[PDB]
Amino acid sequence: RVHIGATNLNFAMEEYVYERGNNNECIFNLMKTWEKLSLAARVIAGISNETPSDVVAVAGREMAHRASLKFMKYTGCTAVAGRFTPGSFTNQIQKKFMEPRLIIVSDPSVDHQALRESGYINVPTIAFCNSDNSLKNVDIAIPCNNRSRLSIGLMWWMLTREILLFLH
């Protein structure tokens, strides 16, 4: 049920949304989901092939913790599971000053802190956006469901496969 989105639709996801469902839920275009995902995976694969550590995947919500952690295993990109410390991208004296060249976020609505810091460090961002999410400070958006456990695990596992057990 990755195609099924939320009820309220953002103006930036109107293109991806195909037609509202029976009880007023947005239904994403499957081909557009794959087309965006393949493009995003290609961008990640291009950067990560030389230096895996410069791709950072954060996952605030609890049903995205496990999926992101395996993505770290099978690609080497650094993954952030718990809360995102507000300044880990800008405070160089901090001992966990991690520098990305690309950021992947499970949800803009939850991981807004990682997204907003990307406007300070000249780093493009990639997000798994739902029909209600705000498309700010992201550059490649994957229109999908990012609340249900099945969709969160599948999309991360699908993304991991294209770059080259996930369910929370």
């Binding site: 030389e50 230096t51 550590s53 410069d54 160089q92 520098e99 060249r101 000249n122």
Partner: protein, 215 residues
């Protein structure tokens, strides 16, 4: 020494030979020692020493706020602000902040391409608080026609000739320098006619040397 960021490591290894490369790709400078390497022998000039005060139960807490301007005389300038309890340290603290706040200064000619570049290319306006500073291109002979406070800054940036028209509470020393730094800041952001050409494709130094920095 002992770099922490990539750009810090790259300049210490001597791989980014020019500050203009950093400005080209809009990379933030987070170590003042980077500017020291790429722009040696920077002239220095302290604008003012304004003392602020905070009321407390036991009295007042006086701190010294320093506005220092830095920049080589060949098109680079920087303004930094720092406040502390000691004049000596506040200058040093503002000394650091001025270096990370380096900005390119685009300058051009007045009527013909003869000689070297002396004056601003077009009309620029600073956008500080009530103070607003306008810079106009001027012929070769005229010096920096400005108040002493922005004349001191404009001298460092390498602008030999300019016309100025200020507006607002210019008695505010801090905003007066800040307005000049703002007009200079957006010189390279104003798209004139000569900048229409897209030019060629250049490689970012953080992508070409991404492998070595990891290793």
């Amino acid at each position: 020494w002992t770099p922490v960021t990539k750009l810090g490591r790259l300049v210490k290894d001597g791989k980014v030979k020019s500050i203009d490369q950093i400005f080209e790709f809009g990379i933030k400078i987070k170590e003042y020692q980077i500017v020291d390497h790429l722009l040696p022998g920077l002239k220095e000039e302290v604008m003012t020493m304004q003392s602020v005060q905070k009321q407390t139960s036991a009295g007042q807490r006086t701190r010294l706020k320093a506005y220092v301007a830095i920049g080589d005389h060949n098109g680079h300038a920087g303004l930094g602000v720092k406040c502390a309890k000691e004049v000596a340290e506040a200058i040093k603290g503002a000394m650091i902040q001025a270096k990370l706040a380096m900005v390119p200064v685009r300058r051009g000619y007045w009527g013909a391409t003869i000689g070297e570049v002396h004056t601003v290319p077009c009309k620029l306006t600073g956008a500080c608080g009530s103070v607003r500073v306008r810079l106009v291109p001027a012929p070769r002979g005229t010096g920096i026609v400005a108040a002493p406070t922005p004349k001191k800054f404009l001298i460092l940036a390498g602008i030999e000739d300019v016309f100025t028209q200020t507006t607002g509470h210019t008695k505010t020393l801090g905003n007066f320098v800040k307005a000049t730094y703002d007009a200079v800041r957006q010189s390279y952001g104003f798209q004139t006619k000569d900048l229409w050409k897209v030019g060629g494709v250049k490689q970012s130094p953080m992508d070409k040397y991404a492998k070595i920095l990891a290793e």
